[PDB]
Amino acid sequence: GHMGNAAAAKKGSEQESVKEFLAKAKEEFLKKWESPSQNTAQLDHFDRIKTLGTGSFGRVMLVKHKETGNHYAMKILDKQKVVKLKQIEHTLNEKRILQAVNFPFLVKLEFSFKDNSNLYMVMEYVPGGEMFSHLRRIGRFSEPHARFYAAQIVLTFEYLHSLDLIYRDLKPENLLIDQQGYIQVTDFGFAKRVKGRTWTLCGTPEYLAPEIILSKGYNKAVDWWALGVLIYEMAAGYPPFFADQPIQIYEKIVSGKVRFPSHFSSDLKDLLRNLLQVDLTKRFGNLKNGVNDIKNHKWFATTDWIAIYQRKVEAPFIPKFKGPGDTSNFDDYEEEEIRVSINEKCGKEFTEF
């Protein structure tokens, strides 16, 4: 066969140990899922420094905690802007999931709270910037460097999916580079605990699986499709379904056609054809052997999964860091004052936050 006796025994034992790890991680998750934290700080506890990114419902700001001096990333959501029914449910999902998960490649939530106008989530500051801007600046990553980042996503999705969590917004914009060159996934705005199917039309156009676009009930395999899009974009410099307007992107996704740069290795193309698979009975991550079809693929043959988890693999690069609170690895955004109304807004919609 492909593996000799010793290699087959080592892999089987490794796979059993993953099961043991995930069972314990699920017990730890459920304790926190069933007893969330809330109201662990207030706005006046922080000095607001700079906007690190923006979104539909607000911004993420670098803040400095006044008493400790630690820097954090504070996501601010305008409660009124969170107007649509699925916008509201998704924000409750985001906070509840972030407070309960624990994994080396998931950002750590430290505080959450709300006031008359806004919702607030205070996370560890990840100073190396978004993968997005490093990728756009260099053009494309080499296959070994794309593989280093991809392996972290594979392990993170293995963890999340074991907890019945779907992520639903993988993209370089949501992947931050830490001081050791490893990934931190942020933005759980579309993450959801799902036991089987779910039906919300959400995500980012270029990363949507065909079954989302086609208004079908879908499952965690949408995240494996998205991994295919991400790996392709990291290695090519642009995503596989690329067009100026969303409707054109959607038509390309549904077609079942992908073309690859001539510099992609055959191993990479094979992996991508199996992730970017419109037929759910054939998509890697969705078959009998689960995540192992991905982890054991030839393109990952050089990947030491445990060493990646332990953060013992040399990273492709270490961001320059010039002291705490440095924002040099982030783009600039227009600054808008944080106004807190004298009247509580949407109090009933956000009772649980």
Partner: peptide
Amino acid sequence: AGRTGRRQAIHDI
């Protein structure tokens, strides 16, 4: 041709 800047998520459609 396609989108090179940061991409916003969609809540519908």
